[PDB]
Design an enzyme around this catalytic site. Structure first.
Site, PDB file in Angstrom:
ATOM      1  N   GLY A  55      29.904  41.181  35.341  1.00  9.60           N
ATOM      2  CA  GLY A  55      30.380  40.853  34.010  1.00  9.60           C
ATOM      3  C   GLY A  55      31.769  40.279  33.864  1.00  9.60           C
ATOM      4  O   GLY A  55      32.189  39.988  32.740  1.00  9.60           O
ATOM      5  N   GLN A  56      32.508  40.085  34.958  1.00 13.09           N
ATOM      6  CA  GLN A  56      33.780  39.380  34.795  1.00 13.09           C
ATOM      7  C   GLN A  56      33.663  37.983  34.230  1.00 13.09           C
ATOM      8  O   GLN A  56      32.682  37.283  34.427  1.00 13.09           O
ATOM      9  CB  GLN A  56      34.692  39.389  36.024  1.00 13.09           C
ATOM     10  CG  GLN A  56      34.074  39.183  37.332  1.00 13.09           C
ATOM     11  CD  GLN A  56      35.081  39.524  38.412  1.00 13.09           C
ATOM     12  OE1 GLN A  56      35.073  40.634  38.985  1.00 13.09           O
ATOM     13  NE2 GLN A  56      36.021  38.603  38.628  1.00 13.09           N
ATOM     14  N   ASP A  57      34.721  37.590  33.529  1.00 13.74           N
ATOM     15  CA  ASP A  57      34.711  36.394  32.691  1.00 13.74           C
ATOM     16  C   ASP A  57      34.253  35.170  33.455  1.00 13.74           C
ATOM     17  O   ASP A  57      33.416  34.421  32.961  1.00 13.74           O
ATOM     18  CB  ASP A  57      36.094  36.163  32.063  1.00 13.74           C
ATOM     19  CG  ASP A  57      37.229  36.124  33.109  1.00 13.74           C
ATOM     20  OD1 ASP A  57      36.949  36.049  34.335  1.00 13.74           O
ATOM     21  OD2 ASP A  57      38.427  36.191  32.714  1.00 13.74           O
ATOM     22  N   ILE A  59      32.231  34.682  35.931  1.00 10.99           N
ATOM     23  CA  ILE A  59      30.852  34.651  36.407  1.00 10.99           C
ATOM     24  C   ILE A  59      29.792  34.848  35.281  1.00 10.99           C
ATOM     25  O   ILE A  59      28.569  34.837  35.538  1.00 10.99           O
ATOM     26  CB  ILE A  59      30.663  35.722  37.493  1.00 10.99           C
ATOM     27  CG1 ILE A  59      30.921  37.122  36.952  1.00 10.99           C
ATOM     28  CG2 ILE A  59      31.644  35.444  38.683  1.00 10.99           C
ATOM     29  CD1 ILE A  59      30.573  38.192  37.951  1.00 10.99           C
TER      30      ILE A  59
END
Ligand SMILES: NC(=O)c1ccc[n+]([C@@H]2O[C@H](COP(=O)([O-])OP(=O)(O)OC[C@H]3O[C@@H](n4cnc5c(N)ncnc54)[C@H](O)[C@@H]3O)[C@@H](O)[C@H]2O)c1
Ligand SMILES: Nc1nc2c(ncn2[C@@H]2O[C@H](COP(=O)(O)OP(=O)(O)OP(=O)(O)O)[C@@H](O)[C@H]2O)c(=O)[nH]1
Ligand SMILES: [Mg+2]
Ligand code: NA
Lengths: 162, 185
Positions: A55-57, A59
């Site tokens: 869920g990092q921005d 990816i």
């Protein structure tokens, strides 16, 4: 019966913890997920194929390449994290407005209910704008992934509601 | 379709690692270091030319012949090694398509998996002994086709944001990377 589940949400929400609490029965120490994890879990005679995608921005543009075949969306939110609830709303609505996700029911894990400042489900429902979603079933399930509370109730909702 | 990774670790060790994991993963659990997911750094490697300890990607080839050539270069000192046959999934990126003409070593022809490759994604393997593929493919009983049969590698357009060229690099002022440029580049 089988159910292909996509589990999405911002980084640090509790997705990978949920996946391993369900599959292993235990609470694991995690690494931030930059690709995906996938496990199959059997519950009340349903084989749940659960995809835990990072869920990092950077990816989030990869999320849509997992939408194909998805029958339930699990969207996990960190309820202590008021500074990011609005960003969480924007990412949710971007998902459900993709054509490949039109028929996926949505379970919200309103996670980290154990934390003191924690937004409760009524508040989460409103901060996520869920009543603007009128074309499919959704439900807000309170949870603490680390203790496992709420998870099987969420899974029950998914079976009952598909 | 399939990808191929030459690796000196045997299948039993891969199974117990949960699959083909990036180097950066061990570094993270060992000393808290965050994994490097800049595709350019992965491709460039270290100043001295080697693989970074914090690398968040795992390299694969697009053909069995290329993987074998890699094994006969990188793994020349191993009398036994494996070529892992791997299904496609969207954490995979064609390095030369994502870095474009700025790919530092385009001869690598690398398709790299961000965060690694789970065991269920490994179709099977070929054993290579003294440089020769003498044996038929051994099938991975842990493979799960239905997980992967409907998924593809990521398209380059969704990889551009991960190119991770250094901040002063000129690519950030050009299509397509300009749309992901960090501030001041
Ligand atoms: N391996 C391939 O099939 C492959 C495919 C295409 C391109 N390349 C190119 O070859 C060069 C080297 O790539 P590489 O991927 O072999 O380097 P690498 O560091 O990942 O692998 C070298 C060896 O290190 C060990 N290793 C790798 N990851 C490990 C881990 N997480 N934990 C413990 N040991 C680990 C294994 O013994 C492995 O064979 C790069 O330039 C790359 O672009 C390699
Ligand atoms: N207090 C509390 N912490 C939790 C709970 N669930 C998960 N966490 C913690 O929050 C942190 C993030 O958990 P993860 O499972 O890695 O979150 P993630 O959503 O997978 O993050 P990404 O992989 O980046 O997309 C970890 O420290 C977990 O231990 C919870 O219910 N309560
Ligand atoms: Mg995770
Ligand atoms: Na595939």
């Amino acid at each position: 019966k089988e159910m292909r589940i996509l589990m999405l949400g911002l980084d640090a929400a509790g997705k990978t913890t949920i996946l391993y609490k369900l599959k292993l029965g235990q609470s694991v120490t995690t690494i931030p997920t930059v690709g995906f994890n996938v496990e199959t879990v059997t519950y009340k005679n349903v084989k749940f194929n659960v995809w835990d995608v990072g869920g990092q921005d950077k990816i989030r543009p990869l999320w849509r390449h997992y939408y194909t075949g998805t029958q339930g969306l699990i969207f996990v939110v960190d309820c202590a994290d008021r500074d990011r609830i609005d960003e969480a709303r924007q990412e949710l609505h971007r998902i459900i407005n993709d054509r490949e996700m039109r028929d996926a029911i949505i379970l919200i894990f309103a996670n980290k209910q154990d934390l003191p400042d924690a937004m409760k489900p009524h508040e989460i429902q409103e901060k996520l704008g869920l009543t603007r979603i009128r074309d499919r079933n959704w439900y807000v399930q309170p949870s603490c992934a680390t203790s496992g509370d709420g998870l099987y109730e969420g899974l029950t909702w998914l079976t009952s509601n598909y | 379709d399939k990808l191929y990774r030459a690796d000196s670790r045997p299948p039993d060790e891969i199974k117990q690692s949960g699959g083909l994991m990036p180097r950066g993963q061990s570094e993270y659990f060992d000393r808290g270091t965050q994994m490097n997911i800049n595709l350019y750094d992965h491709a460039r490697g270290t100043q001295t030319g080697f693989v970074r300890h914090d690398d968040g990607y795992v390299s694969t080839s697009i053909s069995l012949r290329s993987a074998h050539l890699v094994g006969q270069t990188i793994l020349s000192g191993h009398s036994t090694y494996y070529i892992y046959v791997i299904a496609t999934a969207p954490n995979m990126f064609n390095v030369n398509d994502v870095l474009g003409a700025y790919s530092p070593h385009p001869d690598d022809q690398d398709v790299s998996a961000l965060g690694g490759i789970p065991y269920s994604q490994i179709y099977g393997w070929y054993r290579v002994h003294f440089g020769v593929l003498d044996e038929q493919l051994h099938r991975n009983r842990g493979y799960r086709d239905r997980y992967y049969s409907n998924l593809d590698i990521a398209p380059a357009a969704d990889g551009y944001g991960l190119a991770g060229f250094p901040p002063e690099h000129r690519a950030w002022r050009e299509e397509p990377w300009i749309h992901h440029a960090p501030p001041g580049s």
